[PDB]
RNA sequence: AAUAAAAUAUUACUUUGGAUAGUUUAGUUUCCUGGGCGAUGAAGAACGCAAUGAAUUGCGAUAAGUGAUAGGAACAAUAAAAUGUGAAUAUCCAAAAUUUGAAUGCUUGAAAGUAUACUAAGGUAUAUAUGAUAUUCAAUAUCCA
RNA sequence: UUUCACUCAUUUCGUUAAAUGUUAAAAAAACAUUAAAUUGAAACAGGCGAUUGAAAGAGAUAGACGGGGAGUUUGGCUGG
RNA sequence: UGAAACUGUCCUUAGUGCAGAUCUUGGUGGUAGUAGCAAAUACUAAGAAGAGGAAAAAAACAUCUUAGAACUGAAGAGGAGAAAGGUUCCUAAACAACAUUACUUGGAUUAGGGUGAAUCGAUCCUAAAUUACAGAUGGAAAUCCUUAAGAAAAGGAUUGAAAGGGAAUAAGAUUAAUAGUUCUUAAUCAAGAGAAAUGGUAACAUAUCAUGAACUUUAAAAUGGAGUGUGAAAAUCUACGGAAGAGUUCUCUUUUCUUCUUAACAAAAGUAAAUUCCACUGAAAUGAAUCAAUCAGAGAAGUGGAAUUUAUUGGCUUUGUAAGAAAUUCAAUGAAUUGUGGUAUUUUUGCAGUCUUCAUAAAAAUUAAAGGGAAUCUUUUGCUCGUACUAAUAACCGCAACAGGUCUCCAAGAAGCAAAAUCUUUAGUUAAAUAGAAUAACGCAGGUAAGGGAAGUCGGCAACAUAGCUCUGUAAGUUAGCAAGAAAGAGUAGCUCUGGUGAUUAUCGAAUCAGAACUUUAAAGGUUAGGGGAAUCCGACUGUUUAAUAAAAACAUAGCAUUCUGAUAAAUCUAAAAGGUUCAUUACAGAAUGUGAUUUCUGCCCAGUGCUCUG
RNA sequence: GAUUCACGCAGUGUUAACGUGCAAAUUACUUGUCAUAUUUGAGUAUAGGGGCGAAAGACUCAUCGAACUAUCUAGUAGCUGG
């Protein structure tokens, strides 16, 4: 909606913020097997249900 | 079985009373000393129709017999009040309609309206559109009168209890036939939801004790006894009679 | 034609969102919010409109000059002349029979 | 154009401003953006210059 | 159309965001929340559920100032 | 009557699949010691914090860490700076500890807020029930001039 | 034990708990207040004013009624 | 082959031997390169970019620009919002996966950027309703009560609307994207700072003026619907006069098309419609007036005045803002123009009376006025939160880019009674689960057909047929209202003319009706557009109904009838309750039932079972 | 609570299309209806032997002649399968 609470506003930015996937650095690390993000969604696919 | 309509209807959720446009309680006013031992003028301010029930209603003005304002008051409507009239209240009123006075100084034979089954209670009696009640006889030994309820039935009353000289306005409401499903519908609208009535002998076993088998009727006699249960209190109730009426 | 778009974020035809489309300098079209449409005073026995005062908003009758809200009059602004001419007559004759007929009749 | 705290009023803004960089503010507009910081827009006085200022804090 | 079809109308939210669990289960019309229990005092919990005892209770989060208190 | 294209059968090699074998920083059970939370604000939730981080871990506007005491030369995916005048690392210690939550000034929906007093902005106190003491009152409730 | 009289528990009510009790002394849709000169604007009761009233309500025990409702049953053989 | 553990015998122990349980979990076949990738009219040529149209036609080629041809058709496939979604918005790089072929495209991957308010909303108020301390109830959890029970709250606590109430902002420009929010210009609002007035007969009037406390009252905020008439603005159309540009032009066309505009807030040259009041006078031979009404000695008509309303000041033209903007042209930043009208249609917005209800169609915050007489122009500040985007044949809900579903605002021309069907302008798009060739059967969708005309069939199912408007004409039956558009018949085109219906005082204007010669392919029919009649049964009617096999004769209904109840009652919810519903009520009422409009009529039975008795 | 057309809406018929669908109920034409017993948005109230029902045992989140969810519970089975 265009109109929304404080908190809601803020709770939905964090969302945004949580949909990135793995630094590259973060991949060259030795005895890594984090590659991808597992968590992740996209506005079409899941619904956050919030 | 399940719960029956009149099951339903005592626990008032969509059976609420539809009182939102209604005008206010309409009474007389507190019993004080100058209603006991004086007169109180009012002034017939104007004429109202108050939602849900027959009777227009009038917004009386006392002013204060104690103090500084002005005491608004909302009285039932007596056939022949109008607008600008002067109405008194108190024990020694004149005997004139639209003037409140107790029921002991009314002469028998007197009709009054809006009566106070209990002193000072504000109007029980005789409330409805073109309704009365006669005073019969007095009683002076334990001031008690005697008075002839609407119904017909006879009551007796304290001697000063209040009441309201005339006949409630709007009569012969009823005599006038209703034609249409939709005028019936908005009589309704400000009273409760009890309009579309489907017949028991139209429902199911489950739903009402007439709901019925291959054919449609009730199989067990109508009349029943006051002690029955509710759920099964359905037709006529401890009935002294059946049938038309000679 | 020029068609227009709602400046508000209401939309809905209430009686609070009317508009008025005026035209606008290049040939396009406008859309204002136009005020509500009131009623005036009336007097307190008769229930007629008063003369003299407008049919404004409740709060615009401050930004209106002190003379521009009411009659120059007893009672002024609350009941009409005729409403305050029967009072008059009332407060006189009423007090003169009462000099008469009780207070040394 | 500066990112600030979001618990700070636009008044708390323009003074912080004024006493950081030793100059007149005459209107501050805050909108807040997703992430959670607030990005205010400081005009200064027609008197003081903008690009004095950025050059001084370093933006060019 | 009990179906596909009475599904068009469904954008009205039932459920709102807890402030005390944290969870989509406020019951806006009932003011009470589904899960925690809110504005009832104790947290709600409840024998015949088991699991969800498990999932929200001491130990499942961050305990903050618990966790040196009993290695104290 | 003839064909071996398809079909069928065996073996070798390769392929799709992840059985089998070898293995375990994970579980299960029993036993021993304790069973040490909170208005001095708990458990839980939310948000934020790393030079390059999305999760996770740790932490709270002093932020993947501060002081103190031990500890003795590292970390690393890539740079930087610091470092025997003390790097990592450890802790029932010290300071510090955002919004909430029994949540407790009032309100709280996904709500943005806001009242008074004390010491503009900041920080404290003010919920309900209750024990003791102090002080101010109410009721001829009992006497009583 | 029944029939009475009362109120004092009790019930049902009404108001801004606003003159209770006992002594004393329909011509007019208008205004009515913050007093002039302790009185003016009287005193007291151990009842805020009525109503019901030792009956009725709620409890215990006992009889009746009670598909409104709960639990359950509706044998076997058998040219199906 | 494999690269680090393992085996044989004796006792002991057991989670100890699989082909089945529609067994459980995982993997894989034939079917099978099969069924499909067919609603939404549709694409083509040249060029650019790219590895990505090659070739013995490999007949098809995604994106972008231009041209042609088209569709949605302004109740839209247009421009914007509420909910819901949550970064899908904009740009760049990039195409492994995804959009049933492909994609250089994308609502897809990666990285950045993006949401600016004193005036719009939330915040404030209360509606239906909701929830606290104390009190009452309960074994308990908890329930009731919302101002009644209170040493609480002048009077009653919390919450409840982004569609109800509400202090105050507009035009132009700007960004890859935000704009009543930024910029320029021009405004407004709130809170602050620097013995007390005249005029008019009267209705009433005076750039702040011209004192006005407690207390009380009145009004506003704040009130249904229908239909008729009419004021004003805008759009469309049109009359006269032009200025600039564009299209057609070997056939003509003094031609056809485009532009000619103006805000918030204020001013007061000129000038309106309607309603209500005031003064003079007193109406009958009764008058005045509307489309309709309606009104008058508690005073008409007339004349002269006052007030209010008409999208801000004061309604319209006009003025400031303001032409310096903007639009259309021209030249290479600088120049030009920007009249006046209409007895036409629609929309919007007001006003006036009329009709209708056993319907009478909210409250508070907040503001002003009155009765009373207590007391003696400049300037500062305006905080918190939302603001991007879709709003749907691709951004929401249905497992999805699903032919389903989902609340609103603005709204051009033709033709017509019509917001109908059909076509077009402004805007949008040519892609929306792939195409090419051939043109078998059997299909789905749309059609026609000789002669006969329901002989087919359970049954005229399906299809055919009637269809607009005008005039003539119209039965039995009937609740006298209807049937009735009954049935039935005739007319209708094009062109050239004729006449009727007014305004103003000779000029001007409206679509509407009637009539006459002539011609032809003999005329509503492109589209839109009733088949009709004679009877029987059921239900009186309008209405509702088994979401997803029953829409009906079933339910409802008005009407009729019966039963109980004087309110401390009847019905009835609750474990309980100063508890709750009808009830803001009071027998013309409340509660419980049967029958089902109207007409005509409801016969006999009280033994049986109920109900009841004043016994 | 007159007759009709339109925006819309429903679901009479074809017992048409489809029936491993566009769709876990839709599409096309025909039909009916299309403002007062009307249509519709948001808020609010009513809860499982309960609610709500112009009454079909209908509706109560694709679940209704008693919803969904978890515990008793590995409920019992003279019956079927291994």
């Not at chain 2, 969509?14 to 003028?41: M, N, W, Y």
């Not at chain 2, 849900?52 to 608004?72: E, H, S, T």
């Not at chain 2, 429902?203 to 002690?227: A, E, I």
């Not at chain 3, 400046?7 to 079209?29: D, E, F, L, P, Q």
Request: proline letters at 3%; aromatic letters at 6%; a positive charge.
């Amino acid at each position: 909606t265009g109109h929304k609470g404080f908190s809601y506003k803020l709770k939905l930015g964090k969302k945004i913020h949580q949909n990135r996937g793995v630094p590259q650095w973060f991949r060259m690390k030795t005895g890594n097997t984090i590659n991808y993000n597992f968590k992740r969604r996209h506005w079409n696919r899941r619904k956050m249900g919030m | 079985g399940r719960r029956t309509l009149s099951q339903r209807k005592g626990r008032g959720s969509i059976f609420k009373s539809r009182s939102h446009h209604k005008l206010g309680v309409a009474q007389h006013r507190a019993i004080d000393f100058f209603e006991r031992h004086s007169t109180v003028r009012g002034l017939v301010k104007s004429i109202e129709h108050d939602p849900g029930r027959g009777a227009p209603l009038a917004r009386v003005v006392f002013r204060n017999p104690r103090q500084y304002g002005l005491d608004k008051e909302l009285f039932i409507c007596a056939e022949g009040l109008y607008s600008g009239q002067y109405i008194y209240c108190g024990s020694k009123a004149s005997l004139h309609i639209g003037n409140v006075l107790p029921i002991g100084q009314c002469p028998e034979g007197t009709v009054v309206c809006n009566v106070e089954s209990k002193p000072g209670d504000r109007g029980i009696i005789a409330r409805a559109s073109g309704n009365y009640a006669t005073v019969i006889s007095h009683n002076a030994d334990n001031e008690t009168t005697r008075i002839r309820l609407p119904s017909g039935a006879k009551k007796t009353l304290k001697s000063n209890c209040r009441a309201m000289v005339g006949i409630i306005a709007g009569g012969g409401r009823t005599e006038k036939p209703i034609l249409k499903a939709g005028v019936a519908y908005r009589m309704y609208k400000a009273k409760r939801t009890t309009w579309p009535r489907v017949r028991g002998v139209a429902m199911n076993p489950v739903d009402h004790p007439h709901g019925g088998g291959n054919h449609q009727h009730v199989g067990h006699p109508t009349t029943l006894k006051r002690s029955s249960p509710p759920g099964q209190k359905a037709g006529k109730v401890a009935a002294r009679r059946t049938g038309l009426i000679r | 034609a020029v068609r227009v778009t709602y400046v508000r974020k209401h939309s809905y035809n209430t009686k609070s969102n009317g508009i008025r489309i005026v035209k606008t300098a290049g040939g396009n079209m406008t859309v204002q919010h136009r005020q509500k449409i009131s009623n005036g005073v009336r007097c307190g026995d008769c229930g007629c409109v008063l003369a003299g005062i407008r049919h404004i908003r409740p709060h615009q009758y401050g930004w209106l000059g002190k003379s521009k809200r009411t009659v120059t009059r007893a009672y002024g602004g609350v009941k009409c002349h005729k409403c305050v001419q029967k009072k008059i007559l009332r407060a006189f004759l009423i007090n003169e029979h009462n000099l008469i007929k009780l207070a040394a009749a | 154009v500066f990112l600030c705290e979001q618990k700070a009023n636009k008044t708390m803004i323009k003074k912080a401003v004024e006493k950081r960089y030793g100059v007149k503010v005459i209107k501050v507009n805050t909108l807040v953006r997703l992430d959670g910081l607030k990005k205010a827009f400081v005009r200064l006085a027609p008197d003081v210059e903008a690009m004095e200022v950025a050059t001084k804090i370093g933006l060019f | 159309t009990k179906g596909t079809s009475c599904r068009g109308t469904r954008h009205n939210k039932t459920h709102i965001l807890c402030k005390r669990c944290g969870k989509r289960s406020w019951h806006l019309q009932k003011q009470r929340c589904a899960s925690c229990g809110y504005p009832d005092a104790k947290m709600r919990q409840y024998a015949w559920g088991y699991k969800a005892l498990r999932r929200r209770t001491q130990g499942t989060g961050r305990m903050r100032h618990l966790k040196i208190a009993l290695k104290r």
